[PDB]
């Protein structure tokens, strides 16, 4: 790809016209675009889509994602993949041997490394203006690095034996990370730490920062599912984050590489310029739903971030390309062609 | 086990209002259904659906299917399933051993048996009124049974070794069957033989019977894809009908069980009463395309037949339930819990 078309709001519907994908309202064209130009389309909320539109999109291998205001992935349509059986054989086989343990370890290590990167830059920005917070941040980074060195020593024949201990080490490191991030968040935002984390319970956000994080993590999760299936991998045969919850566990495992660089930094940026204020919260039950403006801003920021270029292995490429590439690297490791390594960046 | 809501045509769209699924046009409500009564919604052609309608439908475990005017499946949305990795693993492993051969043989056996069953009914109807056509039908039935008897003796360690032999025997049998069927169809329909099915590169219809067959086989393939997906199987990893076209090979394999009983009998009934006619052809592109009326009639007849009950395995079951039951039977066979058997009621 390719452009990501977004369709949201009452009365808006996607349909085809003269071979072009077209956003319409009240029978009048609003937007027109070549199917070849598209990478994906997002049908959000009240917005609707014709079967002919889905036909023209799938013919062009355009991803079609349905979403609600929470960023929850209602479902997705895409051109079918085939020949996956070999990579899937190696994938199901890897679960019983050391390859899966190495994969899970690389994923957790990648997450901790990116957390340390964000903590490092946060401390760097506050070196003079806020010495105290920078000191707290750097010490939190030191503790996370201690968790990294502890994680390096873990070894097992099978992932099932050490998944608990691994998740515990990751839980400690994540605890230090979020405790460090809380120092940077302004007092008005009421950020008391991550309560939206799905590792324990699907607890819902009562604060704007956790709402933003949950939304962005959902979008990133969609991108990771697409990347995992494009490589011929089975999304639902994960190694680390497994549950009866029904979510694609392998995509959640791959996501550990990109949670910090894609979602966290965007949220930190929007919070830093007060572009998403605490009053943007909308009370639903007791949950903090995003406002429509905050939604459109956060979504546009995340999408522009996914397609933003960065240097990796000598090339400049979009983060989404790095995600597809890492899925391919997982396939390369399953076939034994190349040892897998977690994504790492400092910026 | 719930209504199938069909949504089709220009300007029609599925929305929600007060917890009800609602078919609307130009801002005006046309139809209102509670999702609990729904089991499936069909979005066809120009028809559209909101993301909220999808959320309410998925929340009520209502299947949602997207289809073009020709009935080809585009996609399907459903409640998340867990956990099927074990099933897919055994499925991929079965390709390398005798289980895949057993499955392919059972599929072809069920197909030939059902073809023989329809030929038997066709002959019995004409025993007095048309003795020569009846005799020809019985002869074709005997040729197909000869093909079945040859099929029984085929043996292999894995499907790749013997797939062409199986396809050869199936093709001879199907040729005999379609010649016999052509004997029953009135001359004005111009049905010389079968063409355009998913087993190979498509040969699009130049006559109304082949058009009806293609449409119905497409609907049935959609239902079979749904059945294969609910069972935790991978639809694209088939055993018998492998393809360069990327077609859903496993659902196509499961479909061998059901094409005659579901599609053929309906098409034959519709032809017998002249409810669909040669002039119902519409020359879109270079092919014979069903008129909107013939299309709606055929679709409703197929859904009705799919939901109609019949006697099977000691109980009364809808054919759709039987298809789901056979996907589950395939999973049971992969797990070694139950040797598989193709669908043959008569």
UniProtKB/Swiss-Prot annotation, chain A:
InterPro entries: Cas1, CRISPR-assoc_Cas1, CRISPR-assoc_Cas1_C, CRISPR-assoc_Cas1_N. Forms a heterotetramer with a Cas2 homodimer. Homodimer. Belongs to the CRISPR-associated endonuclease Cas1 family. Its cofactor is a divalent metal cation. It comes from the Archaea. One of its GO terms (molecular function) is endonuclease activity. Transmembrane segments: none annotated. Pfam families: Cas_Cas1. Gene3D superfamilies: CRISPR-associated endonuclease Cas1, C-terminal domain, CRISPR-associated endonuclease Cas1, N-terminal domain. CRISPR (clustered regularly interspaced short palindromic repeat), is an adaptive immune system that provides protection against mobile genetic elements (viruses, transposable elements and conjugative plasmids). CRISPR clusters contain sequences complementary to antecedent mobile elements and target invading nucleic acids. CRISPR clusters are transcribed and processed into CRISPR RNA (crRNA). Involved in the integration of spacer DNA into the CRISPR cassette. Acts as a dsDNA and ssRNA nuclease, binds to linear and circular dsDNA and linear ssRNA and ssDNA. Keywords: Antiviral defense, DNA-binding, Endonuclease, Hydrolase, Magnesium, Manganese, Metal-binding, Nuclease, RNA-binding. NCBIfam families: cas1. It is an enzyme of class 3 (hydrolase). A divalent metal cation binds at residues 170, 241, 256. The keyword Nuclease applies. This is CRISPR-associated endonuclease Cas1 1. PANTHER family: CRISPR-ASSOCIATED ENDONUCLEASE CAS1 1. The keyword Transit peptide does not apply. Its EC number is 3.1.-.-. CDD domains: Cas1_I-II-III. Changing residue 170 to A: Binds but no longer cleaves ssRNA. GO terms for biological process: defense response to virus; maintenance of CRISPR repeat elements.
């Amino acid at each position: 790809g390719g452009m990501r078309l977004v369709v949201d709001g009452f009365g808006k519907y996607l349909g085809i016209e003269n071979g072009l994908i077209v956003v319409k309202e009240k029978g009048k064209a609003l937007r027109k675009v070549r199917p070849e130009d598209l990478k994906q389309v997002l049908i959000i909320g009240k917005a609707a889509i014709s079967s002919d539109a889905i036909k023209l999109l799938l013919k062009n291998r355009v991803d079609v994602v349905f979403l609600d205001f929470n960023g929850e992935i209602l479902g997705r349509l895409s051109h079918p993949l085939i020949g996956t059986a070999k990579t899937r054989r190696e994938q199901y086989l890897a679960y019983g041997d050391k390859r899966g343990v190495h994969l899970a370890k690389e994923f957790i290590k990648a997450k901790m490394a990116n957390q340390m990167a964000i903590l490092t830059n946060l401390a760097k920005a506050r070196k003079d203006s806020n010495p105290e917070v920078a000191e707290s941040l750097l010490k939190a980074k030191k503790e996370i690095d201690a968790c990294l060195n502890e994680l390096d020593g873990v070894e097992a024949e099978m992932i099932d034996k050490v998944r608990e201990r691994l998740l515990g080490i990751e839980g400690k490191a994540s605890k230090h990370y979020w405790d460090a991030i809380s120092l940077v968040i302004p007092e008005e935002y009421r950020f008391n730490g991550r309560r939206g984390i799905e590792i324990g319970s699907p607890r819902y956000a009562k604060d704007i920062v956790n709402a933003m994080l949950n939304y962005g993590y959902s979008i990133l999760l969609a991108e990771c599912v697409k990347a995992v299936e494009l490589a011929g991998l089975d999304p639902y045969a994960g190694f680390l984050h497994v549950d009866v919850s029904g979510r694609s566990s392998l995509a959640i495992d791959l996501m550990e590489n990109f949670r910090q660089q894609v979602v966290d930094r965007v949220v930190l940026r929007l919070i830093s310029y007060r572009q998403i204020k605490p009053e943007d919260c909308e009370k639903r039950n007791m949950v903090c739903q995003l406002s429509d403006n905050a939604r459109r801003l956060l979504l546009a920021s995340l999408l522009e971030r996914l397609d933003s270029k960065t240097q990796y292995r000598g090339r400049n490429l979009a983060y989404s390309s790095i995600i597809l590439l890492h899925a391919r690297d997982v396939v390369a490791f399953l076939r034994g062609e190349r040892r897998y390594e977690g994504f790492v960046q400092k910026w």
